[PDB]
From Swiss-Prot:
This is Autophagy-related protein 18. The 377 first amino acids might form a beta-propeller domain involved in specific binding to phosphatidylinositol 3,5-bisphosphate (PIP2), leading to the association of the protein to the membrane. Association to the membrane can also occur through binding to phosphatidylinositol 3-monophosphate (PI3P). The L/FRRG motif is essential for the cytoplasm to vacuole transport (Cvt) pathway, for the recruitment of ATG8 and ATG16 to the PAS in nutrient-rich medium, and for its recruitment to and dissociation from the PAS under starvation conditions. It comes from the Eukaryota. PANTHER family: WD-REPEAT PROTEIN INTERACTING WITH PHOSPHOINOSIDES WIPI -RELATED (PTHR11227). Signal peptide: none annotated. It is a peripheral membrane protein. Changing residue 238 to A: Impairs membrane-association. It comes from Saccharomyces cerevisiae (strain ATCC 204508 / S288c) (Baker's yeast). Component of the PI(3,5)P2 regulatory complex, composed of ATG18, FIG4, FAB1, VAC14 and VAC7. VAC14 nucleates the assembly of the complex and serves as a scaffold. Interacts with ATG2, the ATG2-ATG18 complex being essential for autophagosome formation. Interacts with ATG9. Also interacts with VAC17. One of its GO terms (cellular component) is PAS complex. Phosphoinositide binding protein that plays a key role in cytoplasm to vacuole transport (Cvt) vesicle formation, pexophagy and starvation-induced autophagy. Component of the PI(3,5)P2 regulatory complex that regulates both the synthesis and turnover of phosphatidylinositol 3,5-bisphosphate (PtdIns(3,5)P2). Involved in correct ATG9 trafficking to the pre-autophagosomal structure. With ATG2, protects ATG8 from ATG4-mediated cleavage. May negatively regulate FAB1 activity by sequestering or masking VAC7 from FAB1. Plays an important role in osmotically-induced vacuole fragmentation.
Length: 321
């Protein structure tokens, strides 16, 4: 049975990306189905555009970009050190190494600017997916107090904008709103979650997670920037309303192994019936929540945006089959 090394949604939450030890696979969420998969070789990093049949492909052990609808190679470039993580927009290319970060235009593929960054073995970044507010942020720890410094960078103008004293320690997890107005960061202790307004840098929401310090894997904003989701080694997913303590609680089933990396995302609100699902009026709106885990399973949840609390489990598909 194949193992899996990477999980990430698209920029909208309508697809599933994966690179396996024997290939890669891409999926869709609402009308569950299989688009594409190749059993070529091992891989490390996979990312997508807003669909458009373009893939970011990295070998497990260079960057290769492939058009799946064309089954052909668009371009290919080499880097000195091992690649760690990238994300995509409609106007720029962003790639990071442990001490270097590179930026390119998506269309013409030519290089634009190079920034020599401090060591980031974890390699956590955050970049807007919108053109008119294209902003990218990376941590700036001092070269071994002021440990939690982040740099606010504009891909349209290729210049730094502002510096924020976000956290007291090393940076752990970052995400940026769909419209690029908000950015949230995670400390190593994971007790304090802070999200800011990008243009002014003023802190707007300060959040408390859990009781004892646990690591934080990743976080993700919603399309309307109303809710934020957190994933950690406590196998528990907490959401925080952006409209303190956690608003509502997500609990993965017991049979799931604890040492799992899990990625979550938030979609547009939906209306569902109360008849088929014993939630405990025919229709009242529900917010869908999707969580895909590195153990190889998908889960569907529904969110009550007044009551909060535990969310009921609806259905679970099993990936790789």
């Amino acid at each position: 049975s194949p193992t899996i090394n990477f999980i990430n949604f698209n920029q909208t939450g309508t697809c599933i990306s994966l690179g396996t030890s024997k290939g890669f696979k891409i999926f869709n969420c609402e009308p569950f189905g299989k688009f594409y998969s190749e059993d070529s070789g091992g891989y490390a990093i996979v990312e997508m555009l807003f669909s458009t049949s373009l893939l970011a492909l990295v070998g497990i052990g260079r960057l290769r970009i492939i058009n799946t609808k064309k089954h052909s190679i668009i371009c290919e470039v080499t880097f000195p050190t091992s690649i760690l993580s990238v994300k995509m927009n409609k106007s720029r290319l962003v790639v990071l190494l442990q001490e270097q970060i590179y930026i390119y235009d998506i269309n013409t593929m030519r290089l634009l600017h190079t920034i020599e960054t401090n060591p980031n073995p974890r390699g956590l970044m955050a970049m807007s997916p919108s053109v008119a507010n294209s902003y990218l942020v990376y941590p700036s720890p001092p070269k071994v107090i002021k440990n939690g410094d982040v740099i606010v960078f504009n891909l349209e103008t290729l210049q730094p904008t502002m510096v924020i004293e976000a956290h007291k320690g090393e940076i752990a997890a970052m995400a940026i709103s769909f419209d690029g107005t908000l950015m949230a960061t995670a400390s190593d202790k994971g007790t304090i979650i802070r999200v800011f307004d990008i243009e002014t840098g003023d802190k707007i929401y300060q959040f408390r997670r859990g009781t004892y310090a646990t690591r934080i894997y990743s976080i993700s904003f919603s399309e309307d920037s109303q809710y934020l989701a957190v994933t950690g080694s406590s196998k528990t997913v907490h959401i925080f309303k952006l409209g303190s303590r956690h608003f509502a609680s997500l609990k993965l089933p017991v049979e799931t192994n604890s040492h799992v990396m899990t990625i979550s995302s938030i979609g547009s609100p939906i209306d569902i019936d109360t008849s088929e699902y014993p939630e405990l009026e025919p229709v009242m709106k529900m917010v869908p929540i999707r969580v895909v885990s590195s153990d190889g399973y998908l889960y569907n949840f529904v969110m009550d945006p007044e009551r909060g609390g535990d969310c009921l489990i609806l259905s679970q598909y099993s990936i790789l089959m």
